[PDB]
Swiss-Prot record, chain B:
The chain holds residues 235 to 502 of 505 of the full protein. Belongs to the nuclear hormone receptor family. NR1 subfamily. Phosphorylated in basal conditions and dephosphorylated when treated with the ligand. May be dephosphorylated by PPP5C. Interacts with FOXO1 (acetylated form). Heterodimer with other nuclear receptors, such as RXRA. The heterodimer with the retinoic acid receptor RXRA is called adipocyte-specific transcription factor ARF6. Interacts with NCOA6 coactivator, leading to a strong increase in transcription of target genes. Interacts with coactivator PPARBP, leading to a mild increase in transcription of target genes. Interacts with NOCA7 in a ligand-inducible manner. Interacts with NCOA1 and NCOA2 LXXLL motifs. Interacts with ASXL1, ASXL2, DNTTIP2, FAM120B, MAP2K1/MEK1, NR0B2, PDPK1, PRDM16, PRMT2 and TGFB1I1. There is a cross-link at K18 (Glycyl lysine isopeptide (Lys-Gly) (interchain with G-Cter in ubiquitin)). Nuclear receptor that binds peroxisome proliferators such as hypolipidemic drugs and fatty acids. Once activated by a ligand, the nuclear receptor binds to DNA specific PPAR response elements (PPRE) and modulates the transcription of its target genes, such as acyl-CoA oxidase. It therefore controls the peroxisomal beta-oxidation pathway of fatty acids. Key regulator of adipocyte differentiation and glucose homeostasis. ARF6 acts as a key regulator of the tissue-specific adipocyte P2 (aP2) enhancer. (Microbial infection) Upon treatment with M.tuberculosis or its lipoprotein LpqH, phosphorylation of MAPK p38 and IL-6 production are modulated, probably via this protein. Induction: (Microbial infection) Expression increases when incubated with M.tuberculosis or its lipoprotein LpqH; induction is TLR2-dependent (at protein level). The gene is PPARG. Rosiglitazone binds at Q65, F66, R67, S68, H102, H228, Y245. This is Peroxisome proliferator-activated receptor gamma. Highest expression in adipose tissue. Lower in skeletal muscle, spleen, heart and liver. Also detectable in placenta, lung and ovary. A motif (9aaTAD) lies at residues 239-246. The 9aaTAD motif is a transactivation domain present in a large number of yeast and animal transcription factors. It is linked to Defects in PPARG can lead to type 2 insulin-resistant diabetes and hyptertension. PPARG mutations may be associated with colon cancer. Obesity: A condition characterized by an increase of body weight beyond the limitation of skeletal and physical requirements, as the result of excessive accumulation of body fat.
Length: 257, 246
């Protein structure tokens, strides 16, 4: 029944709102220009220095560390979202852990896109805006840790997806049966099938003009996966150059691979 | 209506059969059973005998490279059959082929594989998965991931009629770096995706979200292709012919 699917979609969007403080709707409202939500813009070292004044070791490091802690917060939110996904909690506790481990980053980057536009990314819950150019400036190797993400974002944001659509998509991503180490694939695959179903409908209903958005959207997983692998590599390098730099344990456990 | 999509699917199927000599249906008969069994290569002597029926890991690897080249031409001719593909800016065509060929090679390679091995020489022979893995590094783990991808891919239980469209979709990928005009490519891909979706519903009505699962497979493909070149670079570190193969 279409209604059965709609109900699932409603259930997910509702969990998504509850789980994530900064929706895409809000992020867009801040970026688009709708006088009380206006972000302080960071485009240089001075502005960065000022940013602290009102916004929430070394400059490049301090920024990199800022991301790390911020991702940890994302993992917590995503993890909370996952529990809401009908079925996920019933799954064998090991796989629950495995799906999270592989999914979390792909989701982080998908959602990160909601915060981005061609020339920058929102920071500190939307209180600030860091310009792409500044990040790109950052002393090597950090200089190009956000670059790939911006490229994905601009391509992804083009689909014009709404929080409602994303909630289901993010859900599909978590429940991927082909994740290394899975003990029970079949139970996971049946959940996804439902989600894929819920998404397929949602997109059709939400984006009637958008032909094959479902397929277009599913192809993006390729780009997400591509990004993650690039990041890991970059991380490898940073750990070697910067033996001083600490990594959050949660993040460090996910990268186990 | 759907008649256009069914026309496109039939057209692609017929072109696919013409372009590709050893089909999945045909490779499948050989794997399972049904005339002359292929010559089985499982050990060194079998390889040595095999040459006569039809310097180790290297000779084997070059032969895949030789066969890849052959496929590239077979894929090209097939690509040309795809409606709109020839009309495209010629630079774009060369590009879509240049970046699509590896992905398509492995897709079809899966048609030749089963959990225990892979058919070779238009099905005249069979190389064991065990023998391949054995091969000295880095050749050993080289094939091993394809088998894994194949096993998962084959589960979808696709047929030549389904792959034909699927093949087409890969070729018309609008992301490929350096494309001069994306709109028409995407526009055609969009039409292929529609055709594939319907083909899969009609052909595999019981299968739920097969279309979706097939589309997800592309991630695997790209990772495999990325791994492949990753290994190829490493090979580089260990006359005319270099040119033919490049
Ligand atoms: C980053 C996107 C990253 C994607 C990745 O994949 C990253 N991977 C990392 C990895 O290792 O794999 C793009 C930018 C988005 C995040 C930017 C967030 C805002 C900027 C950093 C703010 N911040 N947050 N936590 C810390 C910092 C920070 C950064 C730089 C210098 C100093 C600090 C200070 N700091 C604090 O937490 C104190 C903040 C006081 C403000 C009051 N607090 C609040 O507003 C509230 F609401 F109560 F939270 C700090 C100290 C130590 C370690 C981290 C931070």
């Amino acid at each position: 029944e279409s209604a059965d699917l709609r109900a699932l979609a409603k259930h997910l969007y509702d969990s998504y709102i509850k789980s994530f403080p900064l929706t895409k709707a809000k992020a867009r409202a801040i970026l688009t220009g709708k006088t009380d939500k206006s972000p302080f813009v960071i485009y240089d070292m001075n502005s960065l220095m000022m940013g602290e004044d009102k916004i929430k070791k070394e400059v490049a490091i301090r920024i990199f560390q800022g991301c790390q802690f911020r991702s940890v917060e994302a993992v917590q939110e995503i993890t909370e979202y996952a529990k809401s996904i009908p079925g996920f909690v019933n799954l064998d506790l090991n796989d629950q852990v495995t799906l999270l481990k592989y999914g979390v980053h792909e989701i982080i980057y998908t959602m990160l896109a909601s915060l981005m536009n061609k020339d920058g990314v929102l920071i500190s819950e939307g209180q600030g805006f860091m310009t792409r150019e500044f990040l790109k400036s950052l002393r090597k190797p950090f200089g190009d840790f956000m670059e790939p993400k911006f490229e994905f974002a601009v391509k992804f944001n083009a689909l014009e997806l709404d929080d409602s659509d994303l909630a289901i998509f993010i859900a599909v991503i978590i429940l991927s049966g082909d994740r290394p180490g899975l003990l029970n694939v079949k139970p996971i695959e049946d959940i996804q099938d439902n989600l894929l179903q819920a998404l397929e409908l949602q997109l059709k209903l939400n984006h009637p003009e958008s032909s094959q958005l479902f397929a277009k959207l599913l192809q993006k997983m390729t780009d997400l996966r591509q990004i993650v692998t690039e990041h890991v590599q970059l991380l490898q390098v940073i750990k070697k150059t910067e033996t001083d730099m600490s990594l959050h344990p949660l993040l460090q456990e996910i990268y186990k691979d």
